[PDB]
Amino acid sequence: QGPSFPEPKVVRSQGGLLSLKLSATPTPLAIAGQRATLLTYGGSFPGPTLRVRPRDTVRLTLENRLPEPTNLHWHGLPISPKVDDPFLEIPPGESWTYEFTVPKELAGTFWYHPHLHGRVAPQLFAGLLGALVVESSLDAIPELREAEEHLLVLKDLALQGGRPAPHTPMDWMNGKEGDLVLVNGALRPTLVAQKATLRLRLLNASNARYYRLALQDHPLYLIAADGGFLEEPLEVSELLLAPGERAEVLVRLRKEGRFLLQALPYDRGAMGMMDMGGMAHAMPQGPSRPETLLYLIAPKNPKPLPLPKALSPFPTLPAPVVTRRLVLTEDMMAARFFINGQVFDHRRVDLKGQAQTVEVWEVENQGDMDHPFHLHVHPFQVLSVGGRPFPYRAWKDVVNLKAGEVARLLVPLREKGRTVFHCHIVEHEDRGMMGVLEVG
Ligand SMILES: [Cu+2]
Ligand SMILES: [Cu+2]
């Protein structure tokens, strides 16, 4: 009804159960005016949005129809690492059923993607990703109920011969970015708003591209981070979304018009090649070029809703029992990446922690690139970066660290089991930057 906007098909729980068979399969599709064969969940790029409520049961059978093994990571979900198992391998032609219960106080936008070490970056870049939305009671307050809601999956692509472009040697060093900067698998779609207040769920599902988001003539009001609501809306002029991060923002359309949502220039420290000469500092790639993501058309005579005065109080965490230091380093020319001087070894446990305790993790980026740090299974609170306070209180599962930045994180250890932490520039994970945490 009314104007269409590209958005993944939604699959909803019914009677407390979301039961779904999802095939990972190569799929010819229409894409930015051409046809390409991608790897997809459920025959679509992005994959289908799963939409659940807390205490729902999820029963997702993944049927591997790919030529190579794969698995699923339930990114940001605080469930058992025996369900969200980073070490599982589903061979071609086999299936695996993931079953879990949605935690009672969970809310926000999460996502699913492959996590078979060594093959994450080609599989994710080929199109294997989808969103998971956990509805909240908070969605019923009038200031959010009457907002027009949309999911925006930010994911870039590059095609060669009608297939995902292969990884180059430079891609393993820098992470791969594509020339097609897509929203919900579409190139610069137009959203004709029917309400004056929008609620946009934002997902950066790219391998390595950063999105410094800004909407022409409008601030964004951040109401949720990766893993849940803020305590109250926070107004920002722009919003940096690193790979793997999610956010939810309210947009208040004051005037009629057509407004661009852009990804403004951002220099994440990627390295170029050099062979000609006549420049300054031209080893680095420098800032990205600005990109238009979508066009936003405001409704006639727009009268936006008032902002909610409060959202979700953040639980006070107990005092920590242990301080950890994790130093990120790089060897760019070998494209190898380390945590505390070591590359990932699936047979090696790097940190041993206690269930039902809180730890502080000091993650230090001693490299020259931005590295976005991700911890499976255990959402954390970012206390500070570079010795200065984080601007809001909310659950996060990815924290971006610029060169030289140290983040201090409060990490409550929940479920027992063996899980991983890694850079979410997925090429870096494939090339070393992952370690193993065991909780007992
Ligand atoms: Cu992820
Ligand atoms: Cu990295």
TrEMBL record:
GO molecular function: copper ion binding; hydroquinone:oxygen oxidoreductase activity
Species the sequence originates in: Thermus thermophilus (strain ATCC BAA-163 / DSM 7039 / HB27)
Enzyme class (EC, first level): oxidoreductase
Domain Plastocyanin-like: 31-137, 173-264, 325-439
UniProt-annotated binding residues for Cu(2+) 1: H73, H374
UniProt-recorded name of the protein: Laccase
Binding-site list for Cu(2+) 6: H376, H422
One Pfam family this sequence matches: Cu-oxidase_2
Metal-binding keyword on record: yes
Assigned keywords, A-Z: Metal-binding, Oxidoreductase
Binding residue positions for Cu(2+) 5: H371, C423, H428
Gene3D superfamilies named in the record: Cupredoxins - blue copper proteins
CDD domains: CuRO_1_Tth-MCO_like, CuRO_2_McoC_like, CuRO_3_Tth-MCO_like
Lineage: Bacteria, Thermotogati, Deinococcota, Deinococci, Thermales
Record: residues binding Cu(2+) 2: H75, H113, H424
